[PDB]
Tab-separated table of C-alpha atoms and ligand atoms in Angstrom:
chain	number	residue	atom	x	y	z
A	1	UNK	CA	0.000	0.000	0.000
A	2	UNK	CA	1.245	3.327	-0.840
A	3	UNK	CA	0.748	5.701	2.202
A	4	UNK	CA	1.174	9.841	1.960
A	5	UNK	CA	1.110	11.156	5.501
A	6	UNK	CA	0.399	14.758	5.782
A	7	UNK	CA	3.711	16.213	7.177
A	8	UNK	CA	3.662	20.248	8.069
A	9	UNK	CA	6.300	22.291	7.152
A	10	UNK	CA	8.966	22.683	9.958
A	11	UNK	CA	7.992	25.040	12.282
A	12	UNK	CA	4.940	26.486	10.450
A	13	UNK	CA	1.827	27.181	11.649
A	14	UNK	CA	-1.501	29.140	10.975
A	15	UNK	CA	0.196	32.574	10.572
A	16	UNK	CA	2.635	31.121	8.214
A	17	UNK	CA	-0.011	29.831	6.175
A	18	UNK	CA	-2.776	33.169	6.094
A	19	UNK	CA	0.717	35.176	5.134
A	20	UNK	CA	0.776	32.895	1.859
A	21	UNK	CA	-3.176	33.049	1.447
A	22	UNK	CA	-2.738	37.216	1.672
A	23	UNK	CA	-0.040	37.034	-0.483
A	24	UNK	CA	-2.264	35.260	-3.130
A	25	UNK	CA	-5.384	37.484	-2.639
A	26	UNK	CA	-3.181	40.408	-2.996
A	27	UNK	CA	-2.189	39.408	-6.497
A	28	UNK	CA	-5.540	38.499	-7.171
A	29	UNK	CA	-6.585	41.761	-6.312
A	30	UNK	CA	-3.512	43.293	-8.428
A	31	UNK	CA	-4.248	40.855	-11.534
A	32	UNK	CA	-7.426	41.992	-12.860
A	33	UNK	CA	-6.936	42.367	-16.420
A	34	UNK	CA	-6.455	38.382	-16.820
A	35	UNK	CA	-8.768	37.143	-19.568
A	36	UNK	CA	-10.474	40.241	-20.597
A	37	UNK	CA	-10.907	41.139	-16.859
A	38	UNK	CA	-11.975	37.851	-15.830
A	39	UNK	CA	-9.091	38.010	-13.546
A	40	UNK	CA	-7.177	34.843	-12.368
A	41	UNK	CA	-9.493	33.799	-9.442
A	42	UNK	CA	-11.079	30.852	-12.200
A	43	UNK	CA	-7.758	29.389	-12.678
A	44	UNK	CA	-6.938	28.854	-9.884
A	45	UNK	CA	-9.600	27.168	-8.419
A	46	UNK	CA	-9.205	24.893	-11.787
A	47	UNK	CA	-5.563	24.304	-11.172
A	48	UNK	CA	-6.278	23.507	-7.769
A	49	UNK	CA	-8.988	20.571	-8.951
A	50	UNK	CA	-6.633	19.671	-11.452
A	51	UNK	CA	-3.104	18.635	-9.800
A	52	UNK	CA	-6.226	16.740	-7.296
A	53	UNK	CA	-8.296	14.978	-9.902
A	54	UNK	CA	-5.442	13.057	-10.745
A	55	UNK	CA	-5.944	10.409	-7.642
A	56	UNK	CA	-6.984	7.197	-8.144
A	57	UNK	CA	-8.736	5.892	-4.628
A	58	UNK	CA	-7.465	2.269	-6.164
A	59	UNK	CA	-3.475	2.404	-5.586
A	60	UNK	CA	-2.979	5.906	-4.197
A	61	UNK	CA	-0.977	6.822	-7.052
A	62	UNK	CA	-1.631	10.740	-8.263
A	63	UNK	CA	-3.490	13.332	-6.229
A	64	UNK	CA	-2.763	16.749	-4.777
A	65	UNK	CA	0.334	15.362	-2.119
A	66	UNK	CA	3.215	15.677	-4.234
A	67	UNK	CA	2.932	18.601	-5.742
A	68	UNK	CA	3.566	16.804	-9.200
A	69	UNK	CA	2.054	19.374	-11.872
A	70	UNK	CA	5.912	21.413	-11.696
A	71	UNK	CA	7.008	18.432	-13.535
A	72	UNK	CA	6.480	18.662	-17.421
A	73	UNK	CA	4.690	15.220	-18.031
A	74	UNK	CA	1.906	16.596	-15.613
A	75	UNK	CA	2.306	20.024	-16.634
A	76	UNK	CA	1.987	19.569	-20.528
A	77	UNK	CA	-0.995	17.152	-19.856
A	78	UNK	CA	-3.363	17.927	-23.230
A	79	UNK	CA	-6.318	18.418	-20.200
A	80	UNK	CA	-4.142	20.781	-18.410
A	81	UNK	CA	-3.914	23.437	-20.994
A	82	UNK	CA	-3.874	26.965	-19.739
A	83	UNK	CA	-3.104	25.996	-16.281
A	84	UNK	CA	0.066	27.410	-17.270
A	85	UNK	CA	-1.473	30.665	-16.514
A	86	UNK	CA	-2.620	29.539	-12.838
A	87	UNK	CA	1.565	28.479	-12.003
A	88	UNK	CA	2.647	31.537	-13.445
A	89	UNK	CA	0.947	33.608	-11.282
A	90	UNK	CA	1.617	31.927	-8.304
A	91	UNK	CA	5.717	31.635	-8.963
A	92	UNK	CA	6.068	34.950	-7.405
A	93	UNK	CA	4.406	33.671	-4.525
A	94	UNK	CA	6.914	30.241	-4.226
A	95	UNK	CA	9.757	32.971	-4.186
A	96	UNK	CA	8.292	35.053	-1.159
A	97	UNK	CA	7.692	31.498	0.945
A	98	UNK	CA	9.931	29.156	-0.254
A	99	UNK	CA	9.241	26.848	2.230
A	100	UNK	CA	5.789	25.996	0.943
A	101	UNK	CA	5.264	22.387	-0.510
A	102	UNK	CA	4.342	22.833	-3.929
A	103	UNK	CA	1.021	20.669	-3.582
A	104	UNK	CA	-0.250	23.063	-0.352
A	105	UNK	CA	0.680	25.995	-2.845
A	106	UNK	CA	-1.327	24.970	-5.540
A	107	UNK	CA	-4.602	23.681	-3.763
A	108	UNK	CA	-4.017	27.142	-1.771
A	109	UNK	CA	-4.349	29.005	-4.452
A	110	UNK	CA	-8.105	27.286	-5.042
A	111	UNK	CA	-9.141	28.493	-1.120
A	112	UNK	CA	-7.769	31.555	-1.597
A	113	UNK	CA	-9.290	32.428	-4.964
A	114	UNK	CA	-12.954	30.871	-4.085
A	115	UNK	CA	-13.054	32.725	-0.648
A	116	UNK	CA	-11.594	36.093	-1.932
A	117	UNK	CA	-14.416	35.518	-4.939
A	118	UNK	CA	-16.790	35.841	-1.981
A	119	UNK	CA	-17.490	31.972	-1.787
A	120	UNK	CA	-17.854	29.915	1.263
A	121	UNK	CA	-14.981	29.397	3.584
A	122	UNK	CA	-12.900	26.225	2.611
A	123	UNK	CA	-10.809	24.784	5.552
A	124	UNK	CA	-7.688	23.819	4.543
A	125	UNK	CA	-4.834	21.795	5.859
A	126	UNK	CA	-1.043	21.909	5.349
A	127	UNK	CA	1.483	18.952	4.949
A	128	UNK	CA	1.423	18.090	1.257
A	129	UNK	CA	4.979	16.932	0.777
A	130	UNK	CA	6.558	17.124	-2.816
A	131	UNK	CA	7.647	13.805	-4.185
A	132	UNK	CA	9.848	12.725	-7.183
A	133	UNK	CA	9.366	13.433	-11.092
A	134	UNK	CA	8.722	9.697	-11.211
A	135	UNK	CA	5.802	9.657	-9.261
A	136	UNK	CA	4.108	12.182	-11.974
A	137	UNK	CA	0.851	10.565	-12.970
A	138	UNK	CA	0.637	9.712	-16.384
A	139	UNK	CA	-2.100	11.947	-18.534
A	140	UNK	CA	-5.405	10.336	-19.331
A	141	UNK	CA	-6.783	10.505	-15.904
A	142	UNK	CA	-8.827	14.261	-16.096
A	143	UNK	CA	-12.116	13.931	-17.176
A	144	UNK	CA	-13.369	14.564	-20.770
A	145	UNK	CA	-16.522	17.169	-21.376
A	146	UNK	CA	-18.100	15.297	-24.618
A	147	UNK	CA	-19.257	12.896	-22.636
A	148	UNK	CA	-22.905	12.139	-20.630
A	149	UNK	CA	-23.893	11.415	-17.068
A	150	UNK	CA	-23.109	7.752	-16.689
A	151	UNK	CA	-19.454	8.744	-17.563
A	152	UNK	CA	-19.566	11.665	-15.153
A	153	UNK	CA	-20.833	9.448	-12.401
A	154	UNK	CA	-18.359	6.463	-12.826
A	155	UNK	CA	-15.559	9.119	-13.518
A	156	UNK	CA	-15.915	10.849	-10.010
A	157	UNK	CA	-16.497	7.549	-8.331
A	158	UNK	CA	-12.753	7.277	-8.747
A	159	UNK	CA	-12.394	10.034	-6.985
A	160	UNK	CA	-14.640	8.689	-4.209
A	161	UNK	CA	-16.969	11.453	-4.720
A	162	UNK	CA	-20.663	10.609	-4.665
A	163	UNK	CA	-23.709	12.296	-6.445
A	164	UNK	CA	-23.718	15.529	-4.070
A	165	UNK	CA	-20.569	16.035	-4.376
A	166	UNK	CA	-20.371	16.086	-7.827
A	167	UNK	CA	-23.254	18.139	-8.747
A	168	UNK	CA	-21.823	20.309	-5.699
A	169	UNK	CA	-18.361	20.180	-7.435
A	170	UNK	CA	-19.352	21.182	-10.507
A	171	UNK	CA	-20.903	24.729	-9.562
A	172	UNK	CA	-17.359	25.781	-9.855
A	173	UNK	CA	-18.243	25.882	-13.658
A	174	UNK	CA	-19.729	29.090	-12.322
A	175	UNK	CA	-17.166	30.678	-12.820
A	176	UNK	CA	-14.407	31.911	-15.543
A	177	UNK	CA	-15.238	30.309	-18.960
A	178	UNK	CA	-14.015	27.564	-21.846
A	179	UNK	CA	-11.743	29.009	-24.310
A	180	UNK	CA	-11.194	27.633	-27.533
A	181	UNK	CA	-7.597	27.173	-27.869
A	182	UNK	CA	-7.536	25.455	-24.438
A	183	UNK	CA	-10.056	22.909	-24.882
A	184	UNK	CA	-12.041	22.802	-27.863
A	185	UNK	CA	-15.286	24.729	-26.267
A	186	UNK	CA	-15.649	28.325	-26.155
A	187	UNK	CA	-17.952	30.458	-23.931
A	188	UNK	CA	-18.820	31.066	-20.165
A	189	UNK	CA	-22.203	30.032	-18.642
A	190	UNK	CA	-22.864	33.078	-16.747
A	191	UNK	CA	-22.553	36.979	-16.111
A	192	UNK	CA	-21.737	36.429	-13.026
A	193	UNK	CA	-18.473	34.267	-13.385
A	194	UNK	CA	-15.432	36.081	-11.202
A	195	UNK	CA	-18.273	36.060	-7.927
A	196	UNK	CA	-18.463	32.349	-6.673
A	197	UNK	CA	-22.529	32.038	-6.348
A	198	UNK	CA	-24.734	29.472	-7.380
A	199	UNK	CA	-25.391	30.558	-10.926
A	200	UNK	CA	-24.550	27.483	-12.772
A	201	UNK	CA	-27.821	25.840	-11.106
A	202	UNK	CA	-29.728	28.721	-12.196
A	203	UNK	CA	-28.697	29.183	-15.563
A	204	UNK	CA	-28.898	25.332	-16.217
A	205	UNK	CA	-32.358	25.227	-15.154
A	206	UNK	CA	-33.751	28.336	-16.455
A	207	UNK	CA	-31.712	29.376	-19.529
A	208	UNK	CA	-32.950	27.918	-23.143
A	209	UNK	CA	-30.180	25.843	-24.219
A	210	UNK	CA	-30.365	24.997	-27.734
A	211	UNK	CA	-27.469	21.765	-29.336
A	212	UNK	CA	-24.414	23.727	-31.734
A	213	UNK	CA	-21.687	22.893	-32.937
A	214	UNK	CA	-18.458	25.692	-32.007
A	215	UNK	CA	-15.712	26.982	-34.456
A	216	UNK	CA	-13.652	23.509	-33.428
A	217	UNK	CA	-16.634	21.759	-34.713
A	218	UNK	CA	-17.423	19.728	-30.959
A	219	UNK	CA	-21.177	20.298	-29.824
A	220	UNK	CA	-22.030	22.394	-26.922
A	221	UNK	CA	-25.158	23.847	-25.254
A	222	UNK	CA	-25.730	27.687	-26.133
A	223	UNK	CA	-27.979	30.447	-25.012
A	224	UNK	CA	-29.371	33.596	-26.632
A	225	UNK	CA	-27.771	35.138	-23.803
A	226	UNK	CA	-24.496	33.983	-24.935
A	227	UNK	CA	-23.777	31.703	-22.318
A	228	UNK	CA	-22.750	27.577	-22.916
A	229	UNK	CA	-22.715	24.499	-21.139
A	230	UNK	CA	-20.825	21.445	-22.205
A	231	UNK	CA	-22.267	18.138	-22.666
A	232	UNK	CA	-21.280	17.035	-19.169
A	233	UNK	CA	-22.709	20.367	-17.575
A	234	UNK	CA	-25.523	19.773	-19.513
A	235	UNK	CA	-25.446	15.974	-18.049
A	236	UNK	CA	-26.685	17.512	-14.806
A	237	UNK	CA	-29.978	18.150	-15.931
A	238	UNK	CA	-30.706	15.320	-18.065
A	239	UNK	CA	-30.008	12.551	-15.374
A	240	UNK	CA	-32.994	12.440	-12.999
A	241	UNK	CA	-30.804	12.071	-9.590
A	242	UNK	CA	-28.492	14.899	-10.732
A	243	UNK	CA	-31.318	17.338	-11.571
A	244	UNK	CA	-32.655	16.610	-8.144
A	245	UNK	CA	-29.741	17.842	-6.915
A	246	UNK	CA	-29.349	20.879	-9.500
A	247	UNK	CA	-32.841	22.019	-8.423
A	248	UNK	CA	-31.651	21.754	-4.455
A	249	UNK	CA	-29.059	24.015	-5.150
A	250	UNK	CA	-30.632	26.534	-7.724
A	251	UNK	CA	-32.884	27.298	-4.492
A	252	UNK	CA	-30.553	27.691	-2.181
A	253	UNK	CA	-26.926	29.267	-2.291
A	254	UNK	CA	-26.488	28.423	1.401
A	255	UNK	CA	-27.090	24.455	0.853
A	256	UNK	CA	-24.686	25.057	-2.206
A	257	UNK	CA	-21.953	26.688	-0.038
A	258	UNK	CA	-21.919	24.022	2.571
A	259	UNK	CA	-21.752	20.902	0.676
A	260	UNK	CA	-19.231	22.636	-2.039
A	261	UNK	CA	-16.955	23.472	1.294
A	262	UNK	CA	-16.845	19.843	2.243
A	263	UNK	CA	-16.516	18.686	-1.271
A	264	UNK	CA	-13.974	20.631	-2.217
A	265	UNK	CA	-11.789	20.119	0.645
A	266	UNK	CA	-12.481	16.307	0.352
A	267	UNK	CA	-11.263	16.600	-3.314
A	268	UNK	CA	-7.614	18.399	-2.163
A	269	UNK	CA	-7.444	15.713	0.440
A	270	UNK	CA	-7.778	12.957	-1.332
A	271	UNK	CA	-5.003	10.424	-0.811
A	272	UNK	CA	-3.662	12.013	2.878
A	273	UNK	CA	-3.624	10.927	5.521
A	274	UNK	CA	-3.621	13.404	8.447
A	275	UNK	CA	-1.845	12.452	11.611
A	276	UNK	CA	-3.866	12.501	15.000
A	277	UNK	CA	-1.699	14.969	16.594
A	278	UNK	CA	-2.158	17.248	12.855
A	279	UNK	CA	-3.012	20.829	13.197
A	280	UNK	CA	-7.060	21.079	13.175
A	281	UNK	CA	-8.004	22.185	9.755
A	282	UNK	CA	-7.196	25.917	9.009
A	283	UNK	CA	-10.153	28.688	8.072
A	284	UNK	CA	-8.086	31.671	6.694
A	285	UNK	CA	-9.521	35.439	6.941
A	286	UNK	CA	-10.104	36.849	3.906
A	287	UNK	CA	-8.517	39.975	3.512
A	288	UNK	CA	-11.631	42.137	3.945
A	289	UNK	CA	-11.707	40.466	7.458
A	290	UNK	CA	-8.294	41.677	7.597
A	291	UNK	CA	-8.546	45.173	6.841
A	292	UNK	CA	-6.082	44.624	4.004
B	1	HEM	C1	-16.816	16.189	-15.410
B	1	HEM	C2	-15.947	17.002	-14.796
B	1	HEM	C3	-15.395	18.275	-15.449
B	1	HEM	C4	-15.168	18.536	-16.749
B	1	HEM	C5	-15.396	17.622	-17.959
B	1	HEM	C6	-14.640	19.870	-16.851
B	1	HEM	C7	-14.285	20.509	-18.018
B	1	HEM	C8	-13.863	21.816	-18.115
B	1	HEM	C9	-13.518	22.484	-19.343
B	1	HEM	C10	-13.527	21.801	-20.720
B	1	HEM	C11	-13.163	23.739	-19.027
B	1	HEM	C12	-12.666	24.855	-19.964
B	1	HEM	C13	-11.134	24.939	-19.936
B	1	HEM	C14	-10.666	26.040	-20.849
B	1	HEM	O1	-11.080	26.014	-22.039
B	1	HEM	O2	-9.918	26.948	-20.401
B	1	HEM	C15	-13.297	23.893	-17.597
B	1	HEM	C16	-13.055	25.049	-16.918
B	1	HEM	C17	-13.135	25.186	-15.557
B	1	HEM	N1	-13.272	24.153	-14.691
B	1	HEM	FE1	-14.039	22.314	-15.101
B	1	HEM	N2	-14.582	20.417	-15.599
B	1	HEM	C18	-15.006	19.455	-14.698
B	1	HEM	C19	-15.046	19.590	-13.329
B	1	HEM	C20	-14.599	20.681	-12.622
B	1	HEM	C21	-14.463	20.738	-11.185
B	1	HEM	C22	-14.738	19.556	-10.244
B	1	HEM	C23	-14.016	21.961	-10.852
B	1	HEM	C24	-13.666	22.539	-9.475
B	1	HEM	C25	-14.372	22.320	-8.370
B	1	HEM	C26	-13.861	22.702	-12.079
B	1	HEM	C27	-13.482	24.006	-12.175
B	1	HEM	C28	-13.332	24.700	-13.347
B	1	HEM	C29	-13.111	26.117	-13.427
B	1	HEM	C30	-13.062	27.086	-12.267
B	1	HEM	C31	-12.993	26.446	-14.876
B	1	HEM	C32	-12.757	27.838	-15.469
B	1	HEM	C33	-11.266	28.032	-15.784
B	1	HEM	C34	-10.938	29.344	-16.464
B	1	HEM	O3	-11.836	30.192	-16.648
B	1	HEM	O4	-9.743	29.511	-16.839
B	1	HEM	N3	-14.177	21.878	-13.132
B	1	HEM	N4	-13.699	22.690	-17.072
């Protein structure tokens, strides 16, 4: 059995860790030209599900622990394109705290830009421990978006994640937007998509999607509002348990919040384990709360 236990970085503790956070939501805050004024809070919180997604619950092997996306196998994964953008941005942040593992920097980067985009808090925990170019995860293991919702379910199952907490995960598609160049779909699904609300339940539900093919001739879901969905968004309403779920949220943000918090910190945890005598998990101020 392959075993990753959560190790914190000599001597750090809470303070160390909201100085990184602030240091992020500063730049944030500093970066808001990024994709036609999108800024970079969207990347993030993609590159942070990304160097995560990788796990397999099976063998252990992949996952957010070793900090594995630096290495170019990872990094030039076709799936992975335009995350480039997310590690650029936080390179200037690795040289102000080099003592940061590079997996608690990168699923850092996804707190920091979902609470600082006025989501929910996300409690975090330290102790991610870079490991070896060798333990890089081959590419193949991201999900694809052509796909329907028996693919979406048995995908995510790998993941250990469970109807909720997919649905839950994937009101992240809230925000930013698919690009063209980066993935083959082009379009984002919302006005609202630099605020972290539940929009994508709304818009799937109440928008009138209507089947096109895009300039890279895949099919997508597009509305006279000029918003889009991909096929697995779309996924979400066609599979009765899913649009349950969909509906849930679309009524209530709060609901939303909660069970996104816990799924999204499950996802970044995957694979750890965390020590008895660990720190608690840590709930960083944003920097409102801070006066900064
Ligand atoms: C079935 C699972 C999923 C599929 C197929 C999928 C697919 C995609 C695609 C194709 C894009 C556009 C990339 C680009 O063109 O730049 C995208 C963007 C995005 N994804 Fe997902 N995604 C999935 C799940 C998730 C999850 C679980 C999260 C996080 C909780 C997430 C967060 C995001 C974010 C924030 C963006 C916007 C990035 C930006 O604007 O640069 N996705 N996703």
């Amino acid at each position: 059995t392959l075993v990753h236990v959560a190790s914190v970085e000599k001597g750090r503790s809470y303070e160390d860790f909201q100085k990184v956070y602030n240091a992020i939501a500063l730049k944030l805050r500093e970066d808001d030209e990024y994709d036609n004024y999108i800024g970079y809070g969207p990347v993030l919180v993609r590159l942070a599900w990304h160097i995560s997604g990788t796990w397999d619950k099976h063998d252990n092997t992949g996952g957010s622990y070793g900090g594995t996306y630096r290495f170019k196998k990872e990094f030039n994964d076709p799936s992975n394109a335009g995350l480039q953008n997310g590690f650029k941005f936080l390179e200037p942040i690795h040289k102000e705290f080099p003592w940061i593992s590079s997996g608690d920097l990168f699923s850092l980067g996804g707190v920091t830009a979902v609470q600082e985009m006025q989501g929910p808090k996300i409690p975090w925990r330290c102790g991610r421990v870079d490991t070896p170019e060798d333990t890089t995860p081959d590419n193949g293991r991201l999900p694809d978006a052509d796909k329907d919702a028996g693919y979406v379910r048995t995908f995510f199952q790998r993941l250990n994640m469970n109807d909720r907490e997919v649905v839950a995960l994937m009101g992240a598609h809230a925000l930013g937007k698919t690009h063209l160049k980066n993935s083959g779909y082009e379009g984002p699904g919302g006005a609202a998509n630099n605020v972290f609300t539940n929009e994508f339940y709304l818009n799937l539900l109440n928008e009138d999607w209507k089947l096109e093919k895009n300039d890279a001739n895949n099919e997508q879901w597009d509305s006279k509002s000029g918003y889009m969905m991909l096929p697995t968004d779309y996924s979400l309403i066609q599979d009765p348990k899913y649009l349950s779920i969909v509906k849930e949220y679309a009524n209530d943000q709060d609901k939303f919040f909660k069970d996104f918090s816990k799924a999204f910190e499950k996802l970044l945890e995957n694979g750890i384990t965390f020590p008895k005598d660990a720190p608690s998990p840590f709930i960083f101020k944003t920097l409102e709360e801070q006066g900064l």
